[PDB]
Amino acid sequence: QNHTLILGWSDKLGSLLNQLAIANESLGGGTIAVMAERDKEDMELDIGKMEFDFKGTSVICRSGSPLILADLKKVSVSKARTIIVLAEDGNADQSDARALRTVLSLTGVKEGLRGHIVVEMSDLDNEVLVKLVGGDLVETVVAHDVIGRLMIQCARQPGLAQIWEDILGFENCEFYIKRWPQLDGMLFEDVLISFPAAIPCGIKVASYGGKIILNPDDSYVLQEGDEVLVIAEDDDTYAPAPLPMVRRGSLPKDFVYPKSPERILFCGWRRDMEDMITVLDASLAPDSELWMFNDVPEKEREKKLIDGGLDISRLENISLVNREGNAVIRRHLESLPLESFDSILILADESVEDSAIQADSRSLATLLLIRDIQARRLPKTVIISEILDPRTKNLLSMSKISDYVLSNELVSMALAMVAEDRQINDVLEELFAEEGNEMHIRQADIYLREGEEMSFYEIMLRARQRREILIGYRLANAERAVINPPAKTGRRKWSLKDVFVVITEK
Amino acid sequence: QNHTLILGWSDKLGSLLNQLAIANESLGGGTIAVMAERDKEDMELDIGKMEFDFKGTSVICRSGSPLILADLKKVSVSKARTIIVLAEDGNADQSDARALRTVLSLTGVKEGLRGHIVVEMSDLDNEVLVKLVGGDLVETVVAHDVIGRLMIQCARQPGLAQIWEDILGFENCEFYIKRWPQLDGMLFEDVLISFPAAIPCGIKVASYGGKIILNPDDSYVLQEGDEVLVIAEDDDTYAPAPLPMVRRGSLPKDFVYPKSPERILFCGWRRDMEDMITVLDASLAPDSELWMFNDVPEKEREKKLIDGGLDISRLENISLVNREGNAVIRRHLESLPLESFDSILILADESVEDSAIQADSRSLATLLLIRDIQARRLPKTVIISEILDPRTKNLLSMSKISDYVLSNELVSMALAMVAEDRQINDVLEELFAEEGNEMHIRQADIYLREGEEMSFYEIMLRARQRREILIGYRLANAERAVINPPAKTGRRKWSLKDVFVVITEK
Amino acid sequence: QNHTLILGWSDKLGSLLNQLAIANESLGGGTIAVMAERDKEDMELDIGKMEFDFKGTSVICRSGSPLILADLKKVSVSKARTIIVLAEDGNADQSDARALRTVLSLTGVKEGLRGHIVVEMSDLDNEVLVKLVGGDLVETVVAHDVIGRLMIQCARQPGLAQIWEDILGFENCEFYIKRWPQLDGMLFEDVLISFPAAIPCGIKVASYGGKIILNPDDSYVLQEGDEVLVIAEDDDTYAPAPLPMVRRGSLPKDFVYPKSPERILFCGWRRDMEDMITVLDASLAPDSELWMFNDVPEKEREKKLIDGGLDISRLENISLVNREGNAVIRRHLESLPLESFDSILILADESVEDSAIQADSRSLATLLLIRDIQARRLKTVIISEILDPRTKNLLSMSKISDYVLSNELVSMALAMVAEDRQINDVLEELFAEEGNEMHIRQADIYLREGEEMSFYEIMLRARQRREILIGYRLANAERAVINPPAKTGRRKWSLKDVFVVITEK
Amino acid sequence: QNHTLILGWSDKLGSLLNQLAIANESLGGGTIAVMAERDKEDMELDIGKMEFDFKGTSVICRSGSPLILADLKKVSVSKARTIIVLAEDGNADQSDARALRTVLSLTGVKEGLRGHIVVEMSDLDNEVLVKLVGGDLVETVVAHDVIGRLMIQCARQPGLAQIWEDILGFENCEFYIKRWPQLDGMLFEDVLISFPAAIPCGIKVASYGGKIILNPDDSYVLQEGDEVLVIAEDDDTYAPAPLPMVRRGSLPKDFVYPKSPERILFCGWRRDMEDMITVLDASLAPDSELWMFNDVPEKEREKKLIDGGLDISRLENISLVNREGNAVIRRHLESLPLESFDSILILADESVEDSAIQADSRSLATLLLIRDIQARRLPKTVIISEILDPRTKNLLSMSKISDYVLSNELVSMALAMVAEDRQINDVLEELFAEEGNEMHIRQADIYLREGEEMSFYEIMLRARQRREILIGYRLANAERAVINPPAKTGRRKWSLKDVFVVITEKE
């Protein structure tokens, strides 16, 4: 029926539904079939009570185990254009085992499948497994590690959460891949300035066989059958135009990059800490500090690390220190240089991670503790927290300076994007993983000196000197940010200091 | 409309409902909406099985979570004159977390609120967070800890429980605040005897922006706009009168009597009992002893108690004695020297703190076993027991057993009062806290000599020589104390065995 | 509208219902209401799952708690002829505390109570509390620890369980108390033989305010208003008759008193098992051994017993041996010297005392395993505590492997006290070790071999020992006979016969 | 009515139903009644969601307990041809107790029983109990231990699982017991070659009341009333034939017996694992080591082993190595030397043995992780996995086959067999227990020299010199082994790489 099928049930589904509906809003009616081992009464009730509208969308809730070929016959599995396996609310091993079993069951359909499979997993190690047993039809979104992986992106550099919400979220922007016959033999330095209403930053290469290369080298001009990856409000924006001239300038280069403090605190025993400590060794070089709030004996945690294969003898860019305490009792958090942490991270821990109601509660509690204790300790740092619940992610109501909670809706949004164009998975898997490209903002001192009047494209070419494709600007105002504006590529007026959003390599 | 809204469902709801109805009885009726994550039909059934009369007040049951904005719209939260966030019965931290998120969701209303929020919190540590989140329009009531504090007071000064019940309860003589334009420029010590049908306690000074000072110095001169805080029968029952001619005189009898080391027993282990321990240390004379008969093993007792943040090292004039056993097994209780304890406090154990009637059954068994052992082993001890139930509502028992005991009804009453007039909570706080003023029962010889004939106003004027406000008396052979007596100008001959209940500084 | 009301729900509900139904058939029917915190439809299903006959009695199920007045009013508590508060499953002290709360709530009824309250209680000490709140209205049936005592009693009197089943149950026979103005002025020793169809046990003395003296003196002269307590078949089957001619034989010979150090095994941990230990210590000769095979760790057991308030030094006859293991593992049972035990008691464990069938499964496994091990490796008395009499019925055609007894007896007891509350006193005195108790005695105590005499003459011989002869079990009879029909007629008696007597301590 | 009745409901039920359906195809159809304490509508839904064809057999779903006589009479237990009491969802000791109470209730039926009772047991000790109350009418199938022993056997001779599957399953090969008046007075060693379309295994001796010896001595001379036990396709497919002239060869070579000390890995903790340990200790050569990777703490392991009656000191050929970790966590699995193990046994953990799919899911993850670590760490180890929803678990879409896995379906098959012909249980009881004789896969060089041209009957007669009954072969390049070959008198160029399937004495 060319419909979207979802298997299982979790806190994420809600936001996922919204995302998908938004998509189908641009292409007419939408049909999503959700099936799980639950009452058809129970599912439809929760569906009807959601806080957002399903523009031109219907949700068909059915009771059945994804492991039974007949229950999959009921949901037109062999006809769905996408099959989204959701992670089980609870223990991650149970969720991953059931996910592998559901993918096996999906392979077991004798006729075949019209679409692909989008699996939400909870560990990096098990990912490989699914790709072995589902092969072609399978795309895996490692949810847990991905959220912990962009937690450091939003924490190191404050204000990056809403950027991912607007890019991944189908409302404002999303990734599009379009074949433009005009620009085949065009220099990539000329291609990125060939689009006004969008910003091209990726390239599919026929000679690599549809492989998408992010941040290609400027001087590579492409084949006739090639597709460019741009970002815009909708799939149809104004591109390409005649090449506008830019003031080709020079970087006031600040070779030293001298102050890179990045004393960073973790206030959680996250289920995979080796993952976060390893992704974070791409931050800096000068004795990058890293503090771990354990709640667990330290001799135990060194074994926890060697379990993940992580070596203290190997980590090149940070040498970390360990402190033990508790995150709901106040005097333990008291004895910390909270005022000397460029970032504080309030995680949900191994213990009580399955409990959606209590880990998030501990997170909110620690946030309130830190703000109040510091407000009485003085005679401004950055804080970010992890909230598992979608209801509590919706509890964004406080618009103050510390309101950085990362919805796991991002994962949902990811599951939505891959559900629509699986190619984009291969781009998220690169923009998330630290190797290869990554989204940084304000990477180098003085792209901009002394209040210049340079246009956005002049800066794109100025910063391409450091393998950087430029994406967005902010203003001196807070709680606002705009990404790839359609109005004016070339301009004379704009803010003074370092409101700069980029893809780079580090 | 202006209706009372209650979010959640606990054992204290019925009592609360009762008080609310009493309050609305003066208005000819009222409206209460109750919303919880329960079935509507079952909620209405439970309302039907409650034995009191609603007195023209209607209770409406709606099934919803206070975290969804739509359910809040279903119960007209924006129109409600007051919101009462009850605490769930299961876990102190679980109810505290639910309350924190409920206050957050009530802030999440886009249209705003019309009334104020009264939040029942089950722990002092988590309370501060909700105070911070609520800010301008939130009042917090500390439940478990207030019960703990009041029990020791009633144990040392017997009969205070019924006094608190009558004063807090709307059944008679609740706190009223009214502006009297006639009374202005009069010193407060004359303003107190200016009301024949009411007893003035404190003053809300308009010059101080409206903070209610309790037990002010007599020199205070009334200002324009200032209002009176008084104890009276009903809203239209009290009115000022010309000052009655009254003997000022001087009856200080100043020959003081030293204190005496006392012996106290704690039955069962109570959650947050460390606060009770500290309060009892501050309350007793040097060289006093506290016995603790708890099922918690002696090894875990010191950890679990110091885990509560109690430095035994800061102990001043208490000695600790530990005993292990079940509070309902008679053979365990006979092992203790019950006759040697100056006071006994039967506490609802932390192990069964959740269940109301399941815990109060164990407490009642303990009481009956203690009294039967004191009767049979003998060839008079004051005993106060923690009750939560409608069990006390029966009150089959007679006075010889001190079956008068502290109840959860106090909590309900407090909630209702703060739902009617906000500031009252602050009042109660200083009254319940050791700081500021507090209620006391004092012997008659403190204020008068034996067989001395005088009137109530003269007694009040004599108490004022101690910065104390006379609120009432209990005669020698009277069961119940009398609060706000009617015959204030008329003489009675007072007995050395009589007692007086006064608001006094510390 | 007078009818029986039951508050709570336990496994004993079905059996109790059966007994009540038996009682009400003579009146053409009756009514029983059951109220607990359960679904009405599901309770009605549970009623449907009961295999016995209601005999014109209707059972009403209502969903409500016995603590709210509205639920009690839905079940017409003020009009009810009797209230039966079961001890709902869970923690024994918690169930007894809830029984105290239920009694307190029943006192709160504004309109008052027509009938009396029957309280199922587990702990013996708390009983007075329930009386304190209940006063006149309350009858407490504390049978768990006395049942434990009775198991030990059966280990020396192998058939006593069925005797208790027949007496407590309304089917075979029952205690009846009635006023016969005819017998006024008669010595009791004549009242005993004055009933052909019944055996008089006690007297309700009006001069004593209504107290029932059990096993009264023969010299007692009946006064006006006194009533007779008898064991009889039914209410209208017994009536006094002229005295039968009976030979006063007066020929009991005093024999050699048999005493022997015994070896006993206790399988599984029983609630308040320290009480059973204390009862057994008084029962055995010195240098005797009590073995205890429990899953409870050997280390934790001494604490668990001293919490029960049992000192080991002062009890002296028995010596204790402790062993740890599971009663359902055949290997663990092989670890015990099963062949050496004079008696073995499979006890329903405290962990599964609530659940009927889960407890009886372990008990059945343990019994069959012990029997098979005694068969594979080589007289042993074996008693088994069962909680579903349907288990003893599923066992059928007399397999003869066990002497068995159930907690279902408690239901019977409750039923008795629900009909005639006076009878409770009787029960008390018989179940406690103090005062009177029922016993099975050998024939040689009362007669010589092949002596030809009638039941009445043996009964008088027993009166020479301050005991009321109530029945006999012949040598080759499985079922013992209570209140025999042929009392006046001669018979030849064998030493292998046994007699059932109510005797003082 | 003579319908089949099943008391209880477990995960292995559907498979069992399938087997019954196959059998009832031979009779033109059948009827199966299922009674359990579950919803009727849900039970019929589960039946409707079963993917196989019932072949004219009708399934009836009723909600009731086998402990109430009224439900048993609602399902016509007295008229039933066979009763099958399944065990499910409880500690092995609790579910066996449910079965014991069920058998007692079935004895309690006053009107009597038309058929016999087949009782699935989870513990070996309890069997006699089920006998004692049941006596003649009960046949006991000791389920869990059967799979446990069979896994260890398959690890040392790979592919034995499919052999057991085919022989127990009614599809390709069944045991038949039939009387042939023609073969009277004939030596058993001649009765062996008398059937062209069938392989004679045992004899039903009338002199012993019908007890059947499965490997009679060659000298045994058949008596009147005796019946023959054979492996055949169907009841009407095999018949006796005149004796073929066959070369009475001699055994090729007697060898030095060399025993190589082996290395075994146990993933997950299995109920009664001490039994697997002791069997393997009896099976292996000295100086061998057994690794055990389960989440149960090593401290608790000593208790869990000693209550099962395992003394570590009494082991005489095996030394124990203990390792702790989660079987679905890759990093824990990397800690073990996976490449060095002569055999690996992925066991469904006791913690999830009740739950059907959770155990095989964890097992599948563990298997794929072990294989992937073996792949990614490199400059031919035997691997067996316990699976419980097998037909679906053996993926059939990507031409993908699991590594010699073992199934819970075997239990269903066994039950079905004993439900159809009760006598067969004796066979199973002797074949599945290590006592008496048992099935084995044996290398070819024991029986012949390389490139020797001879027929199946001649190899079988060679095997008879070692008290072994040759029942089949697996060729060198064969995915499946051949049981009851069709051309038995005919020659073939046998390679040493071939293997033979034989019923042999223990020693």
Author numbering:
A (entry chain A), B (entry chain C): 320 to 698, 726 to 852
C (entry chain B): 320 to 697, 726 to 852
D (entry chain D): 320 to 698, 726 to 853
The publication says:
Two DMI1 homologs, named POLLUX and CASTOR, were identified in L. japonicus and both of them are required to initiate symbiosis. To address these fundamental issues that define the primary function of these channels and their role in the symbiotic process, we performed functional characterization of the LjCASTOR channel and demonstrate that it functions as a Ca2+-regulated Ca2+ channel rather than as a K+ channel as previously proposed. We also determined the high-resolution crystal structure of the ligand-binding soluble domain of LjCASTOR and reveal that the entire soluble domain consists of two tandem RCK domains that assemble into a tetrameric gating ring where Ca2+ can bind and regulate the channel. Our high-resolution structure reveals multiple Ca2+-binding sites in the RCK gating ring and provides structural insights into Ca2+-regulated gating of CASTOR.
